[PDB]
Design a protein around this ligand. Structure first.
Ligand SMILES: *[C@@H]1O[C@H](CO[C@@H]2O[C@@H](C)[C@@H](O)[C@@H](O)[C@@H]2O)[C@@H](O[C@@H]2O[C@H](CO)[C@@H](O[C@@H]3O[C@H](CO[C@H]4O[C@H](CO)[C@@H](O)[C@H](O)[C@@H]4O)[C@@H](O)[C@H](O[C@H]4O[C@H](CO)[C@@H](O)[C@H](O)[C@@H]4O)[C@@H]3O)[C@H](O)[C@H]2NC(C)=O)[C@H](O[C@@H]2O[C@@H](C)[C@@H](O)[C@@H](O)[C@@H]2O)[C@H]1NC(C)=O
Ligand SMILES: *[C@@H]1O[C@H](CO)[C@@H](O[C@@H]2O[C@H](CO)[C@@H](O[C@@H]3O[C@H](CO)[C@@H](O)[C@H](O[C@H]4O[C@H](CO)[C@@H](O)[C@H](O)[C@@H]4O)[C@@H]3O)[C@H](O)[C@H]2NC(C)=O)[C@H](O[C@H]2O[C@H](CO)[C@@H](O)[C@H](O)[C@@H]2O)[C@H]1NC(C)=O
Ligand SMILES: CCCCCCCC/C=C\CCCCCCCC(=O)O[C@@H](COC(=O)CCCCCCCCCCCCCCC)COP(=O)([O-])OCC[N+](C)(C)C
Ligand SMILES: *[C@@H]1O[C@H](CO[C@@H]2O[C@@H](C)[C@@H](O)[C@@H](O)[C@@H]2O)[C@@H](O[C@@H]2O[C@H](CO)[C@@H](O)[C@H](O)[C@H]2NC(C)=O)[C@H](O[C@@H]2O[C@@H](C)[C@@H](O)[C@@H](O)[C@@H]2O)[C@H]1NC(C)=O
Ligand SMILES: CCCCCCCCCCCCCCCCCCCCCCCCOC(=O)CCCCCCCCCCCCCCCCC
Ligand SMILES: [Cl-]
Ligand SMILES: [Cl-]
Ligand SMILES: [Cl-]
Ligand SMILES: [Cl-]
Ligand SMILES: [Cl-]
Ligand SMILES: [Cl-]
Ligand SMILES: [Cl-]
Ligand code: NA
Lengths: 282, 100
């Protein structure tokens, strides 16, 4: 099946000073957002009609309350211990936790934490593992948190028992959106001149879903190895955008074409032809 | 906890630019830390009123990213830009949309 294969929640907790901290959170299938966190209410925002997967309303409400208590208590404890951990404000903590479906059917879970944009800890084998970037502070943190009865057990249950069934349920519940096929459109433009006597040609591919896509500059049937793939960029409403560039000498632009392949096209590639002398768009 | 990362800023149209035809203007801001950031979309140097944006997310290297977008109708003479403020910047950074 196509589309996302993983679910995760993220946390960004920003500590301005000793009496003011705020947390943002959200839930995701790969890079598609399916849950928001509403700080006005301490409850979640379900962005799709299928965002609860196969979970009952009652279990969903229990999990929302877990997150609400956790978010409040996380700020309370960090602020209480910030002095002992020699913390300087402002600072920012991030967390990600979830699970993913692999080839062969295994589901693997993960939990990672960061401080100051650097890795701080991870959970491996239901244990707290300090990251080397986290230094002695992370060692100190792991030794302290594992003494929290309930937190260790609740994290274990959520990662290894709740997440895998949630993931399968929501991948199934959302398959109409997650496995839909959306065709790209493509067009050609100039790029910034690389320098004297050279041109950059740009092949734009926009509006495709799912994310895997193939784009190449061609001379007839010969793929141009010089093709430079840009980073895939988001559009609103769950589609993607991609630029493929080629730097050529002025007199060598004629004869070039851009070919696009995508799962939605059922084998009918898009072919665009570069024409020189300003004849590139009727 | 100490090195900050400045935002990368990429501005692009949802559809090929056709003058007089409605379109969507995207500004993708990424690679930055910490998360607090101010992003505006500009038309002829003036801030656009109704802009939408994604909830906060971050990449595997912990850098944050956001998508800002709005409807726009390109013309031959009007200009559009993305303007970003961040603690790593002493002044706002402006990246202009350029269909070419
Ligand atoms: C949300 O969906 C989850 C996934 O459901 C499956 O996938 C989706 C896409 C649809 O296709 C569904 O129709 C489909 O069920 C549910 O979780 C899954 O529940 C089933 C039970 O329905 C459960 O199957 C049991 O598995 C155990 C063995 O599990 C161990 O071993 C496997 C490897 O072999 C390992 O992967 C596991 O992690 C465990 O270590 C087995 O003993 C059971 O057999 C018993 O029951 C069967 C009939 O069901 C009977 O024939 C046997 O003779 C015996 O009595 C049974 O096969 C899946 O393992 C489980 N999957 C996961 C990843 O957890 C989920 O169900 C809820 O949670 C379950 C854990 C279970 O407690 C259910 O009763 C719950 O309703 C569902 N709902 C929620 C709320 O999450
Ligand atoms: C994946 O997770 C497994 C489940 O937790 C883990 O197995 C556990 O390993 C523990 C050691 O790391 C072991 O703890 C011991 O428990 C005995 C009583 O049963 C106790 O005597 C002993 O105490 C001593 O050591 C402590 C420090 O370790 C010390 O604080 C204490 O005061 C005293 O000196 C120790 O606590 C668990 O019993 C064990 N549990 C289970 C269910 O297996 C895996 O790690 C170990 O796995 C096997 C055991 O199956 C062992 O051969 C090795 O010790 C592994 O390290 C873990 N996997 C990996 C790869 O780490
Ligand atoms: C529909 C969508 C479904 C989503 C599917 C699920 C996927 C989500 C996947 C993963 C989600 C991971 C969840 C994180 C929160 C779990 C802990 C918690 O919340 O406890 C409570 C807050 O307790 C507190 O207030 C203390 C807060 C201090 C936080 C310290 C940092 C812990 C970092 C971790 C470092 C790892 C250390 C090593 C770990 C082995 C919550 O309130 P409670 O429940 O009412 O009370 C439980 C009582 N107990 C805490 C005693 C148990
Ligand atoms: C601790 O930080 C608080 C919040 O800072 C605000 O939000 C952050 C996200 C960041 O953007 C920051 O720049 C913001 O200012 C302070 O509260 C703020 O205080 C200032 C000015 O004194 C005020 O501008 C803000 O409105 C206010 N934010 C609120 C209330 O949401 C704390 O300052 C104290 O609170 C004030 C209301 C006031 O009584 C003042 O005397 C206090 O110092 C910061 N406290 C400390 C110890 O510095
Ligand atoms: C359905 C609903 C969907 C609802 C989904 C929507 C939103 C829900 C998201 C919220 C929950 C997110 C959980 C994210 C996962 C993991 C947690 C990350 C761990 O964080 C850390 O790394 C901790 C870093 C600490 C930095 C060290 C400096 C602080 C020192 C202060 C000491 C604190 C000691 C505390 C001891 C207790
Ligand atoms: Cl809250
Ligand atoms: Cl410390
Ligand atoms: Cl639980
Ligand atoms: Cl074209
Ligand atoms: Cl080669
Ligand atoms: Cl402008
Ligand atoms: Cl990581
Ligand atoms: Na204090």
């Amino acid at each position: 099946f196509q589309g996302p294969t993983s679910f995760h929640v993220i946390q960004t907790s920003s500590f301005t000073n000793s009496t003011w901290a705020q947390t943002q959170g959200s839930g995701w299938l790969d890079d598609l957002q399916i849950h928001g966190w509403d700080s006005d209410s301490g409850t979640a925002i379900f962005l799709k009609p299928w965002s609860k997967g196969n979970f009952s309303d009652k279990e969903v409400a229990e999990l929302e309350e877990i997150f609400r208590v956790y978010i409040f208590g996380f700020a309370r404890e960090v602020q209480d211990f910030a002095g002992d951990f020699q913390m300087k404000y402002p600072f920012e903590i991030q967390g990600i936790a979830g699970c993913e479906l692999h080839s062969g059917g295994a589901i693997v879970s993960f939990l990672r934490g960061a401080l100051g944009g650097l890795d701080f800890l991870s959970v491996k084998n239901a244990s707290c593992v300090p990251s080397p970037e986290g230094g002695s502070r992370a060692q100190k943190f792991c030794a302290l948190i594992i003494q929290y009865q309930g937190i260790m057990e609740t994290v274990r249950i959520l990662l290894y028992e709740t997440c895998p069934r949630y993931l399968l349920g929501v991948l199934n519940a959302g398959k109409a959106d997650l496995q839909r096929q959306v065709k790209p459109e493509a067009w050609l433009s100039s790029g910034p001149s690389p320098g004297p006597g050279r041109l950059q040609l740009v092949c734009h591919v926009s509006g495709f879903y799912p994310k895997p896509v193939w784009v190449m500059w061609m001379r007839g049937e010969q793929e141009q190895q010089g093709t430079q793939l840009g980073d895939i960029l988001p559009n609103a409403n769950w589609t993607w955008y991609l630029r493929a560039t080629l730097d050529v000498a002025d007199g060598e632009a004629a004869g070039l074409s851009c070919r696009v392949k995508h799962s939605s096209l059922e084998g009918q590639d898009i072919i665009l032809y570069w024409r020189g002398s300003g004849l590139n768009d009727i | 906890p100490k090195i900050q990362r400045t935002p990368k800023i990429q501005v692009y149209s949802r559809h090929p630019a056709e003058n007089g035809k409605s379109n969507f203007l995207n500004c993708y801001v990424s690679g930055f830390h910490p998360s607090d950031i101010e992003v505006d979309l500009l038309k002829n140097g003036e801030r656009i009123e109704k802009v939408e944006h994604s909830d906060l997310s971050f990449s595997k290297d912990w850098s944050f990213y956001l998508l800002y977008y709005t409807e726009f109708t390109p013309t031959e003479k009007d200009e559009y830009a993305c303007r970003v403020n961040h603690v790593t910047l002493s002044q706002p950074k402006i990246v202009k949309w350029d269909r070419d």
